[PDB]
Amino acid sequence: STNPPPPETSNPNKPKRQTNQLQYLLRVVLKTLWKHQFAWPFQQPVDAVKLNLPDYYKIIKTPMDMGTIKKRLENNYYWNAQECIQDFNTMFTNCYIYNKPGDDIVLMAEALEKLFLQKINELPT
Template identity: 40%
Template sequence: FQITSHEWSAPFLQPVDVVGLQLDDYHKIITKPMDFSTIQNKMEGKDGTKYKSVREIYSDVRLIFTNAMTYNDEHHDVHIMAKLLLEKFEEKWLQLLPKVENEERKQQVEPNDVPTTDTSPEDAIAKLAKDTDDEVGPLMDCYSFYCCVGID
């Protein structure tokens, strides 16, 4: 099951329609809006930005849900949906974190070390995704992370 396919994911797939929803105070409360389409664009290098690490993707996915919980009252449907999806996302992240940390250690090159491979960080992240696929599902493919976070 994928996070963007979850029945409650719709409010988080595209940027908040501030004008259409008449949310005049949205940008005063939410200083860094985020949504899954923006994450996808950043993964693809659109808009001149690109993620440098898996942790940046993780941070932006969290931001989607924390923004929704910040803006909406705790009894609002969007707040409740964001809270549940964030909890599920965090559960999956904790399962993956040891592999992420291991890959980060591999990527750190000491000043006197000579790299033994031409693996780019993107390739290393993709390899990490492949290696963890059997254990925690399709959670970390660098180019489809935003839609492939498994939700039970």
């Protein structure tokens, strides 16, 4: 009954990349989602202890949240934008797997994912 440490946000030996697509994910995509009215349940790791979800980290093998994604973008974590896009998708999918369909938190993730895919549709080449 104890939360795992949050996901890694840096790499101990990797060049930081810096590209049109990576700056876009931080400056446009992450920023737009972060300020969304539904963002707040996703801005930090799931606190399974406080929320009394004893099975969350047994069911969700790769936890992910927007605070982690933001730090990964700020640090040297990603090799490319598609690695970051996968983290967003993992965050949404975790919510869909753990929670019942139609639950409020699932509806919120769906609205964030719809906005995310709209922003990804305009990813620079």
